[PDB]
Amino acid sequence: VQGLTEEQRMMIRELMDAQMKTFDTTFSHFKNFRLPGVLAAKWSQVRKDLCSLKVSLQLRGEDGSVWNYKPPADSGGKEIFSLLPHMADMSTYMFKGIISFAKVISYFRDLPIEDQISLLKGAAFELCQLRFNTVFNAETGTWECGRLSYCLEDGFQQLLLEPMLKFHYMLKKLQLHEEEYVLMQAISLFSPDRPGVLQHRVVDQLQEQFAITLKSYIECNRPQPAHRFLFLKIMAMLTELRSINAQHTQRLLRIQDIHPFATPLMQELFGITGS
Ligand SMILES: COc1cccc(N(C)C(=S)Oc2ccc3c(c2)CCCC3)n1
């Protein structure tokens, strides 16, 4: 790109290299996942917690066959948990790609292992949502995950009330480059204020370099009036994503409390000990 320092161009490359190596955009290796079965104040809030992300699910076979699953309606029972096992498998698959992404980046390997763990615990969800946005189809409200499709159930303005859905639509509208998505991932990963981080100074210095690189990238490759304040818009979305992360963590722990579903990797990322 233009106007970047050699160190910034190298920084952008290694992020792009790590994204290329660890983001299976066709989801070809997402396999052996569970699928929905065939044929007191907690519950009110878990009932409200689960209805926030209502999606149907399509599976296109290599032979051309199509399986499609329409979820039930909430009717006061355990049917609200039908996609929990499948969604756990997908998020687990994505978390593994995220962990692989961090471990390739030199700036991440060079951190102490305890801080590596702390940063991944704090940012794994956010980097997952950033990767899902690149396969989000805002015209059809569908995350195109290769042979899997997650379609939002029916208007458009009433769904933007859901913060994570609003995030995906608003982030998609910015029409970001691959380089800007991966820089967002690095900024979110290297957040110095996550619980348990010890090397706050180096992590803060690294994050600042990633933000400066992103600011510089935008200024060198986006002169259009539509991209005025784009960097600031991106940074605001990252703050919103952190809020959504905290929201979603409390959501998940409440559902986990009355209906266990978290995989071992999810338990590790969310602090669940097993006792
Ligand atoms: C109760 O909270 C839960 C339950 C189970 C899994 C999760 N996680 C951690 C994640 S990343 O779920 C998502 C979030 C967004 C999306 C998908 C999964 C799949 C495709 C559509 C976009 N969260």
State yes or no: 200 annotated in a binding site.
no
Ligand 1, closest atom to CA 251? 1
- E strand or H helix at 219: helix 200-221
Measured in angstroms, the resolution is 2.2
> Which residues form ligand 1's pocket by a CB distance below 6 Å?
84, 87-88, 90-91, 125, 128, 132, 143, 150, 251-252, 255
Burial class, 78, CB count within 10 angstroms (exposed 0-12 / middle 13-18 / buried 19+): exposed
Q: Please tell me whether 132 is known to bind a ligand.
A: yes
Strand spans (E) along the chain: 55-60, 66-69, 136-137, 142-145, 148-152
Is 130 annotated for ligand binding? yes
CB 120 within 8 A of CB 266: no
Look up residue 178 and give its two tokens: 């691959």
Q: Rounded to an integer, what distance in angstroms lies between the CA atom of residue 241 and that of residue 238?
A: 5
Spacing, Cα 219 to ligand 1 middle (Å): 34
